[PDB]
């Protein structure tokens, strides 16, 4: 997370967000491609502004 | 009398440009500075 908070005039909080949530997807373990440098990575990126 | 009033009126106003001034303006509903995001390889910058 990378955030930049700021108070408005009414007391609400506006934020500038940069969210990433990733993990490691695993292929079949029985085949040879599990011992080389193939970590299939799946990510999820969100960039917006909310208040 | 007139030679005193004319001299003391044109010699008094001559006895007496714009000064600089720094103002601070707080923004309540927006951000100063640029915003940056990415589309998988490339960076976009918004002024």
Swiss-Prot record, chain B:
Q: Report which superkingdom the organism of origin falls in.
A: Bacteria
According to the record, the segments passing through the membrane are none
Q: Which residues form a coiled coil?
A: none
Report the gene knockout effect.
Answer: Insertion mutants are hypoinvasive in the HEp-2 cell assay.
* Localisation: Cell outer membrane
Concerning its family, UniProt says: Belongs to the bacterial secretin family. T3SS SctC subfamily.
Protein purpose: Component of the type III secretion system (T3SS), also called injectisome, which is used to inject bacterial effector proteins into eukaryotic host cells. Forms a ring-shaped multimeric structure with an apparent central pore in the outer membrane.
**Quaternary structure and partners:** The core secretion machinery of the T3SS is composed of approximately 20 different proteins, including cytoplasmic components, a base, an export apparatus and a needle. This subunit is part of the base, which anchors the injectisome in the bacterial cell envelope. Forms a stable homooligomeric complex. The complex is composed of 15 subunits.
> Any idea what this protein is called?
SPI-1 type 3 secretion system secretin
What organism does this protein naturally occur in?
Salmonella typhimurium (strain LT2 / SGSC1412 / ATCC 700720)
User: Could you tell me the gene encoding this protein?
Assistant: sctC1
- Give the fragment's position in the full-length protein: 155 to 205 of 562
């Amino acid at each position: 997370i990378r955030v930049l908070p700021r108070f408005s005039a009414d007391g609400q909080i506006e934020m500038s967000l940069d969210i990433e949530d990733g993990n490691d997807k695993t292929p079949q373990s029985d085949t040879t491609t599990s011992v080389d440098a193939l970590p299939e990575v799946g990510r999820t990126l969100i960039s917006t502004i909310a208040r | 009398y007139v030679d005193m009033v004319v001299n003391a009126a044109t010699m008094m106003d001559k006895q007496n440009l714009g000064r600089q001034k720094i103002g601070v303006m707080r923004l309540n509903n927006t951000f100063v500075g640029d915003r940056t995001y990415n589309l998988r390889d490339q960076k976009m910058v918004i002024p």
